[PDB]
């Protein structure tokens, strides 16, 4: 259940935003380069339109690729018309982990205060792939990384963490 | 709206199996075949094993595409364990096209009698993409194509049809 040597796993990185640019990713940058700095692999980045197709499309694919066992979406879980990412999402999980959405909003709770209502961040499972989305927000997305997300994809993670259960 | 003139229709097949190859695949043969006898467009063709995701990349990327209007899929309708293309489908629908099901159970009733018990045909539009799973059969795809799919795609048609809902 446990190992006692760190275990890199393959992350991919999406932008949900319709004008970020790579140049003006912040959240993206941080995650890549948070993800790299502790050990993980990143196979993949890319940077959507706020459209509902456009995330199923990619997210899809590396929900049916053998190497992508990990994808971190920062952006489009607002209250917003434009806001897709849930919507996009939530019909293609096999299974939501709810400890997620509600640990993260815990943690950003005592951090921004009310301001917390204005996200819909949610996790879940499709074909053993994990997926995680969070705000564009790059202090929601250090926050989720370092509390959260970060420990989870350690293997040597006490009691349990997702390893053991993650594509090959 | 109805034109005066044939108008062409950039069409997508895909056949859901996982022995089939492009040799022995009589029903995607078919419709590419008949497709273009018609004087529509083909703009690409794929087969994939009878999994839930596989299905949901491939048809993911034709919904987001700015050139495929029409998607054709058949196989997997059927009631075994590993027929999941209803099942792939229908979360990726914004409205479902409840008369095509209906219709084609009922064609099919008059031909094969009430082994049309054994198939889950089913069609949506998603991103104004028309969607048509059909069974793996070719008689089916003969008895869907000619006396239903054919005549909605022809523009001419009335009362009505398709074409002024079709993507740009």
């Given amino acids: 259940q446990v190992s006692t040597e760190f275990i890199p796993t393959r992350i991919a990185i999406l932008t949900v935003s319709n004008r970020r640019g790579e140049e003006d990713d912040t959240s993206?940058?941080?995650?890549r380069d948070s993800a790299q700095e502790?050990?993980?692999?990143?196979?993949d980045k890319a940077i959507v339109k706020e459209n509902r197709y456009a995330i199923r499309?990619?997210?899809?694919?590396?929900?049916?690729?053998d190497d992508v066992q990990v994808v971190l979406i920062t952006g489009g879980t607002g209250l917003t018309e434009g806001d897709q990412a849930p919507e996009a999402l939530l019909p293609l999980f096999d299974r939501e982990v709810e400890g997620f959405g509600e640990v993260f909003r815990m943690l950003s709770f005592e951090?921004?205060?009310?301001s917390t209502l204005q996200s819909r961040a949610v996790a879940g499972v499709a074909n053993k792939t994990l997926i995680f989305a969070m705000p564009g927000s790059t202090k929601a997305c250090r926050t989720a990384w370092e509390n959260?997300?970060?420990p989870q994809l350690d293997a040597r993670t006490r009691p349990?963490?997702?390893?053991?259960?993650?594509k090959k």
Avoid: D, K, M, R
Avoid at 38 to 43: D, E, L, N, R, T
Avoid at 57 to 65: E, N, T
Avoid at 111 to 114: A, F, H, P
């Fill in 28 to 31: 993206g940058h941080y995650l």
């Fill in 38 to 43: 502790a050990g993980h692999h990143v196979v």
């Fill in 57 to 65: 499309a990619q997210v899809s694919a590396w929900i049916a690729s």
């Fill in 111 to 114: 951090e921004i205060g009310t």
């Fill in 148 to 150: 959260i997300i970060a």
């Fill in 160 to 166: 349990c963490n997702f390893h053991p259960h993650l």
